Amino acid sequence: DEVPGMADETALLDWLGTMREKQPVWQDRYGVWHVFRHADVQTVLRDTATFSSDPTRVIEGASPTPGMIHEIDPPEHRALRKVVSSAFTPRTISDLEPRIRDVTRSLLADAGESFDLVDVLAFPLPVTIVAELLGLPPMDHEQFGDWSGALVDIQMDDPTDPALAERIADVLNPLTAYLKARCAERRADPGDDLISRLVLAEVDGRALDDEEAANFSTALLLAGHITTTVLLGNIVRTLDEHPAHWDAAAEDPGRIPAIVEEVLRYRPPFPQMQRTTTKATEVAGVPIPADVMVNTWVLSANRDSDAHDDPDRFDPSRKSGGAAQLSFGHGVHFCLGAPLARLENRVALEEIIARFGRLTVDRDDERLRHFEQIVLGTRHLPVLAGSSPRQSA
Numbered sequence: 001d002e003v004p005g006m007a008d009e010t011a012l013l014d015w016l017g018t019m020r021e022k023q024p025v026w027q028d029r030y031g032v033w034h035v036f037r038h039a040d041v042q043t044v045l046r047d048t049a050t051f052s053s054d055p056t057r058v059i060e061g062a063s064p065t066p067g068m069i070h071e072i073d074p075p076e077h078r079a080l081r082k083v084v085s086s087a088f089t090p091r092t093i094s095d096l097e098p099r100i101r102d103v104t105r106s107l108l109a110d111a112g113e114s115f116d117l118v119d120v121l122a123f124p125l126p127v128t129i130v131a132e133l134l135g136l137p138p139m140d141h142e143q144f145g146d147w148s149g150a151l152v153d154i155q156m157d158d159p160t161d162p163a164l165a166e167r168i169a170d171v172l173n174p175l176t177a178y179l180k181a182r183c184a185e186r187r188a189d190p191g192d193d194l195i196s197r198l199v200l201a202e203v204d205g206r207a208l209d210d211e212e213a214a215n216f217s218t219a220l221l222l223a224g225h226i227t228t229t230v231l232l233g234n235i236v237r238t239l240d241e242h243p244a245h246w247d248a249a250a251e252d253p254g255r256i257p258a259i260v261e262e263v264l265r266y267r268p269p270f271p272q273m274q275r276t277t278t279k280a281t282e283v284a285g286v287p288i289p290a291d292v293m294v295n296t297w298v299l300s301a302n303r304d305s306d307a308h309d310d311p312d313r314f315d316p317s318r319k320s321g322g323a324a325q326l327s328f329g330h331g332v333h334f335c336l337g338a339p340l341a342r343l344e345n346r347v348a349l350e351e352i353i354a355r356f357g358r359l360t361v362d363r364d365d366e367r368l369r370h371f372e373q374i375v376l377g378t379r380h381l382p383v384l385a386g387s388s389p390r391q392s393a
């Protein structure tokens with residue numbers, strides 16, 4: 001059996017290609033059903049009645065975690081998402097550009113000629129913007145990275161194991177307790193921020209209870225930084241592999257959003273996602289029973305030649321983007337933060353090119369280590385300044 005790990009990208013991609021070819025719907029040794037083709041991934045994600053986002057159905061003795069937007073289906077999903085949806089509109093998000101650019105430019109200006117992109121910018125920018133979105137203070141950013149890292153590196157094998165779900169609860173316990181305390185504070189003294197908005201909202205004619213609002217806040221915080229960090233790293237790493245694009249972008253900065261969409265397609269931060277079948281069903285003629293877990297490979301769908309011509313060629317001129325960006329999901333759970341992620345990464349890339357022209361990855365620096373699981377990225381990305389304002393006579 002054995003799915004290759006995320007850390008060896010080449011091995012993983014090769015394995016996905018063979019599966020698209022020879023076993024596009026595959027049951028693994030844990031009874032988890034993997035879906036590899038673009039068209040079938042779209043089918044699964046669109047059909048929420050059959051493919052629930054709630055994992056707890058197949059986790060022995062588990063009950064739903066209340067307030068977890070990413071685990072709730074229609075008709076309940078609409079009402080929860082409506083609580084926060086206006087916080088994320090393009091017009092509202094666009095107002096954040098000056099703040100994002102200020103943070104990015106200040107962070108980059110203090111970097112030497114050799115630095116870890118992750119510690120300098122990719123982590124601090126997204127954690128700052130999400131903390132600010134939630135009304136949280138800067139002193140707490142380090143806790144956020146520690147808690148995220150613990151979750152991302154949680155010991156995991158079988159994803160239906162109730163011991164995993166329990167372990168996840170334990171790891172998030174401090175973060176959730178912290179946010180519950182902040183929810184309580186906002187009920188007593190509300191602000192413009194997202195936590196205030198969520199604690200004062202009505203869903204089904206009643207406020208979210210304390211547990212629901214703390215869990216909802218925990219999901220918002222985690223969603224708001226981890227993948228943005230991963231993508232910005234993947235952007236520079238991917239440009240480094242296709243560096244003719246550094247000059248094309250310097251010459252025409254209006255190319256950057258297209259570069260971002262294409263890096264998303266090429267290296268999705270979150271390469272797979274899970275659903276659970278609510279009834280006996282079928283994917284591409286393959287019978288799947290009721291009450292099992294299904295794993296959709298966004299990464300495999302994005303490299304599927306039936307969907308993308310020459311799929312392993314990095315090509316910003318491809319027409320794909322907007323709501324068709326599968327790396328943000330598809331259908332009802334399509335990423336709420338998508339405009340915000342696109343803006344943060346656009347600004348980051350503009351400022352990188354503004355200051356440095358290009359960054360070269362130092363591929364032999366031992367801090368360059370890929371994540372082993374869950375996300376598709378590197379924990380650090382040691383880089384070297386192409387040029388910078390620091391260079392003298």
Ligand SMILES: CC[C@H]1OC(=O)[C@H](C)[C@@H](O[C@H]2C[C@@](C)(O)[C@@H](O)[C@H](C)O2)[C@H](C)[C@@H](O[C@@H]2O[C@H](C)C[C@H](N(C)C)[C@H]2O)[C@](C)(O)C[C@@H](C)C(=O)[C@H](C)[C@@H](O)[C@H]1C
Nearest residue numbers: 065068070151152154159168219222223226227269270374
């Ligand atoms: C709200 C939208 C985000 O959801 C989460 O962050 C939620 C809160 C996480 O949920 C946790 C908490 C929980 C109690 O709800 C639990 O039931 C599930 C299994 O794990 C994500 C689904 C979680 O993913 C899950 O982590 C588990 C430890 C393992 C699981 N599978 C690989 C089995 C993975 O999906 C990550 C690590 O936050 C993913 C991030 C990095 C994204 O990239 C995603 C793009 C991520 O940012 C979004 C999916």
Ligand code: HEM
Nearest residue numbers: 069070223224227228231269327328329333335336337341
């Ligand atoms: C490049 C960076 C990002 C990527 C790749 C990404 C990816 C995704 C994906 C694939 C989903 C759907 C999960 C599913 O269908 O099960 C999702 C959902 C979500 N994302 Fe993002 N995300 C990014 C940034 C953000 C940011 C900055 C925010 C702001 C908080 C955010 C908030 C959310 C929320 C609230 C959901 C759940 C939506 C719902 O279930 O209705 N995301 N994200």
